Structure 1
Amino acid sequence: EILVTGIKVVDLLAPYQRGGKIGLFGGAGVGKTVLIMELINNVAKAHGGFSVFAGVGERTREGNDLYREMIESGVIKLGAERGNSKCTLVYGQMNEPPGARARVALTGLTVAEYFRDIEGQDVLLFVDNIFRFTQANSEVSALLGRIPSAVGYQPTLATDLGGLQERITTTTKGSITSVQAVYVPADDLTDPAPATTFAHLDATTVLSRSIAELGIYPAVDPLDSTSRMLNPNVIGAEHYNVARGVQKVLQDYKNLQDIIAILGMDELSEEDKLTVARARKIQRFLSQPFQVAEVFTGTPGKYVDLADTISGFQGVLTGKYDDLPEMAFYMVGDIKEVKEKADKMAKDIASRKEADNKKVSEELK
């Protein structure tokens, strides 16, 4: 069953299962904490069950910020009305020794598994940096007297990660929607700890450093994020064909990334310049402002419905918006806001000659 998040690239190219395991793969500064905070902001408010946030090896300032935001927004209540709070925080942050960071994910799993098994609830479980469990086990494993495996991790990486991640399961008596941030250590997806994590998840959202350096946020790699929900028999053929067309245009642009660099766009074919134009439109259109990023970016966040995403990317794929410039697609909500930004981008170049602003005889008012 689909779980709509309001994120355009997530709902289009790798939709999240309602009771599935979700990975947010990232490389230290690409935005897998901002993305998981936006998923908390968008999903956990529309959810009817309990949330369990497990903080494994992340910043203590982030745990305090999440506690104050959850007290302020009302999902955590203090004192006598504590029973109406809908979130449990379990925090094993990066100031703790590696014994504490190795088992705090198990504490978060236990609190979530009581709500799933005994209470019969549908649970949300957000785990920030499930990599830190693996890193803490590799830290304690050198002193347990083991021979190290590949690049320096413990020999028991796959079985420890499996024994952790197979406890997070939508069973017959309850569901857990798990969103786990995974950290890739040196922007290496071939590192064994994210490469082992890739086989445990129903929907990976691989965030990239280069997409973030283009200014695109959320910096989701469209040709590296996958989901089991992207299947025409579960999400309908229209949504699936739109996602596959967007991926085809982006892959055809990524095939032209070396000719454009060493020769320029003037040597491309006329059919390929249209591919590059539509791909540079759809890769600005995948970006989106977030309600949790509005405090440091200034722009208000945008929640985008699923039909607006499919209807927008249909129009950019078929060629309905070759008129509008590329920056009209950048950091806007839906396909209406593209047209309402290309208006403001052409009022403004006509606003070079509007008036000469002067306020005179004013100093004694």
Structure 2
Amino acid sequence: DLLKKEYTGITYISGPLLFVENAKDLAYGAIVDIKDGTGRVRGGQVIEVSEEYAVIQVFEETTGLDLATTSVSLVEDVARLGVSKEMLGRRFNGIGKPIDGLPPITPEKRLPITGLPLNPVARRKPEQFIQTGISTIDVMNTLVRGQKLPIFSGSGLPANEIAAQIARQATVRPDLSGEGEKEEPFAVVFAAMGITQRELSYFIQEFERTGALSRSVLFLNKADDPTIERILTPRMALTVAEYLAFEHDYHVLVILTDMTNYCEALREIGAAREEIPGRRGYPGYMYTDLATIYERAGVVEGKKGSVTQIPILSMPDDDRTHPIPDLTGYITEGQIQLSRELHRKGIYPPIDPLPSLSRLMNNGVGKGKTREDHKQVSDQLYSAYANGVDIRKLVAIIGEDALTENDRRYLQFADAFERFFINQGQQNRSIEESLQIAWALLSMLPQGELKRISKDHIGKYYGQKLEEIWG
């Protein structure tokens, strides 16, 4: 319709909530406009409606609202976002309004921001190998196109630099896979929740230096912005990404800066409503709410486009058992975990390979995709590094003078692994260079101890010295 219906009769304002009595015509989940006595207009969403009264969560702050002159009017029935192909190269705030000083977007469509679940019959398996240029990721924790692979970080650890490097260096390798299709650049959708000025400035400078701002859509919710606006930012970002990918055949990469802030806003709303908590006060429906966000990535059969997700979350301590990383690990398809111990030793990127995991690795590696020795080399590297790590504790207990020769070989392997494979700096390595370094490290062990590698590959690739490349 074209009429506006106003509801005076607010009976309760406290925190982020607001009650209105005679609002039985407001549908569940609708978007409203809250008008002040001085004319300032704020937004809100209906979260519970009855014939007695309706409950509204307010996005902005409630300063200046009063119970006598405030009125609530309906904007739309369903929360929708006007999307277009011309949002590439634009900047928006946490609710989709432009903040770059340009005129608004003429919408080709209006799509609901909660989205709809994908039919599992309509999906297809991710298969395309993505070369990030980082050896600890490309060789042991391979990322494929259509994956959700979050980064588990800490307070002082450089997760943002790693995300920028991945976005800068990512490419597919049609020559190895034999597809032969000329690669187009990734389109980037960037969603920030409670980001600080330092991190935002770093990201903006990086995107300007790489020249990727012509392919990027930015949704910015800063640290001084209202908290309840964070409920809407990832949904809008994923709506735009899905539209671009499954309507115009783009290959979209999505970065979410801090899921901790999203969970904090969720906890605020849940505690205001007296929900039954889970662990540490988080609401009991946080699994469903997080799954409605992560599960919007993937590849759809019959279409060329794809959506790839790289969430970033800082663990509230160095605790993997906190509710947020636990639920995220239950939902996503692996993780990249950073290590503070490696960071204190001057190693960049400080990726710890043992707690890291990639669930879709077996689909995109092997014969005809990268090389036929990839998986066995990865498994052997994992086993040897685990043995060296375990021998370190025996050294710390009994002293390093009582060791045998085999234990000292494993200890030297672990030290060289940390100093050469993980630590690479800002350089961009190809997959063949990483495999060459990996085979150089494995040649420091006896040929009979490589149990997980087939004898043919051992005959083909063993024996190269590390000093032929790094000497």
TM-score (norm 2): 0.62
Stretch moving more, 247-256 or 52-61: 52-61
Q: Secondary structure at the match of 1:56?
A: strand
Q: Does 1:37 align with 2:172?
A: no
Q: What is the rounded CA distance, in whole Å, between the counterparts of 2:129 and 2:210 in structure 1?
A: 26
Which of 378, 399, 408 lines up with 1:243 in the alignment?
378
Q: Secondary structure at the match of 2:232?
A: helix
Q: What is the rounded CA distance, in whole Å, between the counterparts of 1:233 and 1:5 in structure 2?
A: 14
| Distance of aligned partners of 1:267 and 1:63 in 2 relative to their CA distance in 1, 3 Å threshold | same
Q: Secondary structure at the match of 2:283?
A: coil
The match for 2:390 is 255
Which of 120, 130, 134 lines up with 1:7 in the alignment?
134
Stretch moving more, 134-143 or 153-162: 134-143
Which of 284, 288, 310 lines up with 2:435 in the alignment?
310
Q: What is the rounded CA distance, in whole Å, between the counterparts of 2:138 and 2:190 in structure 1?
A: 23
Which of 30, 47, 54 lines up with 2:191 in the alignment?
54
Q: Please tell me whether the aligned partners of residues 391 and 410 of structure 2 are also in contact (alpha carbons under 8 angstroms).
A: no
Partner AA of 2:144 in structure 1: Q
Alignment of structure 1 residues 1-365 onto 2, 5 Å: 1-43=128-170, 47-76=184-213, 85-172=214-301, 173=303, 174-231=305-362, 234-236=365-367, 237-290=372-425, 301-319=426-444, 339=468, 342=471
| Distance of aligned partners of 1:49 and 1:233 in 2 relative to their CA distance in 1, 3 Å threshold | closer
Structure showing the higher helix proportion among its residues: 1
Partner AA of 2:439 in structure 1: Q
Partner AA of 1:161 in structure 2: L
Q: What is the rounded CA distance, in whole Å, between the counterparts of 2:427 and 2:364 in structure 1?
A: 29
Structure showing the higher strand proportion among its residues: 2
Question: Looking at both structures, which has the greater relative contact order when contacts are Cα pairs under 8 Å and sequence separation is at least 6?
Answer: 1
Deviations 1:336-361 (A, max 9, x none): 9965654xxxxxxxxxxxxxxxxxxx
Stretch moving more, 127-136 or 276-285: 127-136
Partner AA of 2:168 in structure 1: N
Q: Return the offset for 1:74.
A: 2.5
Q: What is the rounded CA distance, in whole Å, between the counterparts of 1:54 and 1:232 in structure 2?
A: 29
Partner AA of 2:149 in structure 1: I
Q: What is the rounded CA distance, in whole Å, between the counterparts of 2:129 and 2:397 in structure 1?
A: 43
Q: What is the rounded CA distance, in whole Å, between the counterparts of 1:338 and 1:155 in structure 2?
A: 55
Q: Return the offset for 1:16.
A: 0.4
Partner AA of 1:141 in structure 2: G
Q: Please tell me whether the aligned partners of residues 17 and 202 of structure 1 are also in contact (alpha carbons under 8 angstroms).
A: no
Q: What is the rounded CA distance, in whole Å, between the counterparts of 2:228 and 2:350 in structure 1?
A: 33
After superposition, the CA RMSD in angstroms is 2.4
Q: Please tell me whether the aligned partners of residues 366 and 375 of structure 2 are also in contact (alpha carbons under 8 angstroms).
A: yes
Q: Please tell me whether the aligned partners of residues 288 and 302 of structure 1 are also in contact (alpha carbons under 8 angstroms).
A: no
Q: What is the rounded CA distance, in whole Å, between the counterparts of 1:282 and 1:229 in structure 2?
A: 25
| Distance of aligned partners of 1:338 and 1:70 in 2 relative to their CA distance in 1, 3 Å threshold | farther
Q: Secondary structure at the match of 2:150?
A: strand
| Distance of aligned partners of 1:28 and 1:193 in 2 relative to their CA distance in 1, 3 Å threshold | same
The match for 2:20 is none
Deviations 1:234-285 (A, max 9, x none): 3344111111111111110221232111222211221111011111111222
| Distance of aligned partners of 1:257 and 1:97 in 2 relative to their CA distance in 1, 3 Å threshold | farther
Partner AA of 1:18 in structure 2: R
Deviations 1:145-178 (A, max 9, x none): 2232112211111011011111223223331111
Aligned length: 311
Q: Please tell me whether the aligned partners of residues 21 and 203 of structure 1 are also in contact (alpha carbons under 8 angstroms).
A: yes
Q: Whose radius of gyration is greater, 1 or 2?
A: 2
Q: Secondary structure at the match of 1:282?
A: helix
Q: What is the rounded CA distance, in whole Å, between the counterparts of 2:414 and 2:209 in structure 1?
A: 41
Deviations 1:305-348 (A, max 9, x none): 11111111111112289xxxxxxxxxxxxx99965654xxxxxx
Q: Please tell me whether the aligned partners of residues 14 and 229 of structure 1 are also in contact (alpha carbons under 8 angstroms).
A: no
| Distance of aligned partners of 1:3 and 1:271 in 2 relative to their CA distance in 1, 3 Å threshold | same
Identity, in percent, stands at: 26
